[PDB]
Design an enzyme around this catalytic site. Structure first.
Site, PDB file in Angstrom:
ATOM      1  N   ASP A  43      12.254   2.689  -2.778  1.00 41.94           N
ATOM      2  CA  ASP A  43      11.280   2.089  -3.088  1.00 41.94           C
ATOM      3  C   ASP A  43       9.824   2.946  -2.956  1.00 41.94           C
ATOM      4  O   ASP A  43       9.899   3.976  -2.295  1.00 41.94           O
ATOM      5  CB  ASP A  43      10.560   0.723  -2.253  1.00 41.94           C
ATOM      6  N   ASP A  45       6.101   2.385  -2.887  1.00 45.06           N
ATOM      7  CA  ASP A  45       4.829   2.035  -2.258  1.00 45.06           C
ATOM      8  C   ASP A  45       4.977   1.448  -0.749  1.00 45.06           C
ATOM      9  O   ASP A  45       5.655   0.571  -0.808  1.00 45.06           O
ATOM     10  CB  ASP A  45       3.804   1.100  -3.403  1.00 45.06           C
TER      11      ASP A  45
HETATM   12 MG   LIG Z   1       6.806  -1.214  -1.433  1.00 52.36          MG
END
Ligand SMILES: [Mg+2]
Ligand SMILES: [Mg+2]
Ligand SMILES: [Mg+2]
Ligand SMILES: [Mg+2]
Lengths: 211, 211, 211, 211
Positions: A43, A45
């Site tokens: 991922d 963020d």
């Molecule tokens: Mg995230």
């Protein structure tokens, strides 16, 4: 709030631990000793980038009193084409990415951000994390669609075997495809609140991964 | 010494506390009961704003291989005239500023940032912290350059009675003039490293003040 | 109980501190630098001795299903005449007592235990903590009387200026007479439950004082 | 290095976690769902009993200036025939023993204590932990003396599948025979020092198991 002026504490509370499977990068690397190159995924963020600066500016600029900015293509065009110059790389991600490059793994980024006409995020990531061309793959902007985990199909399609992320949907995306989901702590100064319950699926959680 | 793969732990370590004078905003407020309006001051960086996004961008842009950006007028012009749009306000500061405004106290900001021809930081602070005009005061840029005054001197000049800050020099500035220096924790994802030892002078440290 | 199988956590919770005034023995000693000899006092149970072994045996022997043993003179005669051979001295108390002897302070012990016809507790304490004759004073068995703090009058009578203890009534006894009440953490394996809220009166609490 | 009067702290340190595989009793129970009755084992000292009171008394009585009491038959006769009346049962052990009894598992205790002509420890354990006769087994004294078998050998002999203990040698005993070694935290007021590094072999460690 309101709460006692002097709440006090006790040593049971001071020593109390949640039953969480904490791991270190070294332990992860060791668990993979001898495994040939594979595809792994991150991922973005609050996993590899503290990107709250851009999301904060976006909210203030485009929807000061709501979350509507996250559905605004004008916001995404800003967020994906330069606002990551203000995003602060996470040390846990430097360590993980270095480790996976050392292994010869293929590295993918799978984000809930919406796709845009152009994006400079892939370049930001390759540059900041010193990812060689062979290991690097263009960021997958999977978007966000309530009722669906938009990441799961991407993990299957790329045969991603380990997926790192801060959100519950990162871990459950890994679970959906039989991959190893490993949790990174979201920083407490992130603007994405509430903080997730890291470890709530019995998954491994990386120590000290808030920075 | 080895950093063992499985270092383990023990309950002495789990329960171990540093001898810190922790305080809450409510305790500070309580200590001021009945005290008439006064001048209070805040450091800016890592005290009221997580401004690392702009400092990070500045370092990358202006001195990727040194700390020279901090002495670069071109950086400061960017940092003081809009890059704080990407700075993340600290909740501890919202609570402190609200509490002091409610008291009718005068709010000052005293920073070690280099001064610029113009600055929009004052507006950013007033807007984000909802500081009424009657309580607000333009940011003071303190330091050791010709024609400047030090943080200590400004505290003295404005009769600031409480000074909040994250750095050792914020606490010593207050101590040097007989003001009450109160420490705020620098977030672990700050790019300003190493983190200070909050409480290093036996001063009060606000709990949970990293966000 | 019942509670989630995998509760998880987050970094706000992991870093969260109660607003408690923690202190070390060295800080206490420093705060007293230059002060001439004075009278100081210690609670016994869970302050200087982990005496749960005797209280546990007492409960099992004299009142397995109630707290009646604590009003039984047959219990007190056992507890005060040898069961402290099984009581484990606390390191925090070794350090505090050594420090107060270094200062030339008079040392008192004021306990909620009931008085007995004879007692060997004073000897146990002098022996285990290496207290010289001049500093040592016979233990004061103040008893326990609901509705009264039996310790307060003793602190006044002996002009005790600092009182160390684990229970709320130790701290409030100090408060009653204007003495400095300092909290020691009760160990989590103590049989005296619930554990007190150390710091709930805004008092100093000694770090790591559970052992 | 100096141990400063006011050492301070920082939020990296406050939030720092050791990479430990923490587990709860409920998680262990869950992992055994559907598994038929089996033999399980517990170490005694600092695993199910805080027995330091008797060991403390033994050291003072029999070898105040050495560890010779641990090789003294006179000590062991006292320790194994009544001094456990002053031993404090651990709550973690109450929960584990209850859980395993409910499963219909056989309960074994395997200790490194020296054997004696008679012992009343078995009765102490059955009585305090409410272990039904059908689940209870007399304490096994394991070691390296002629005619003895080691902890490993006893685990093998009794087909013990899970072994709970506080010491490294409890975990390695289990590991050596392919049993599941699960660590319990030694209390910080134990007289058996230094505390072990719970989790030193990557084994499961039960949360909050110091009491
Ligand atoms: Mg995230
Ligand atoms: Mg600052
Ligand atoms: Mg007490
Ligand atoms: Mg043991």
């Amino acid at each position: 709030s309101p709460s006692p002026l002097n709440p006090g504490t006790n040593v049971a509370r001071l020593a109390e631990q949640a039953p969480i499977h904490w791991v270190s990068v070294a332990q992860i690397e060791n668990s993979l000793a001898g495994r040939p190159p594979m595809a792994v995924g991150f991922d973005i963020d609050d996993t590899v980038l503290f990107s709250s600066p851009g999301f904060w500016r976006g909210k203030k600029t485009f929807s000061p009193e709501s979350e509507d900015y996250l559905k605004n293509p004008v916001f995404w065009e800003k967020m994906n084409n330069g606002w990551d110059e203000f995003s602060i790389p996470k040390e846990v991600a430097r360590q993980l990415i270095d480790m996976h490059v050392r292994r010869g793994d293929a590295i993918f980024f799978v984000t809930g951000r919406s796709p845009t006409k152009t994006e400079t995020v892939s370049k930001t990531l390759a540059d900041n994390f010193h990812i060689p061309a062979t290991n690097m793959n263009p960021v997958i902007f999977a978007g966000d669609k309530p009722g669906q985990n938009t990441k799961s199909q991407w993990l299957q399609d790329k045969n991603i075997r380990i997926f790192y992320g801060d959100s519950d949907n990162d871990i459950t995306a890994a679970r959906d495809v039989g991959a190893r989901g490993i949790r990174i702590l979201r920083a407490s100064n992130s603007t994405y609140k509430p903080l997730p319950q890291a470890g709530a699926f019995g998954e491994e959680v990386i120590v000290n991964s808030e920075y």
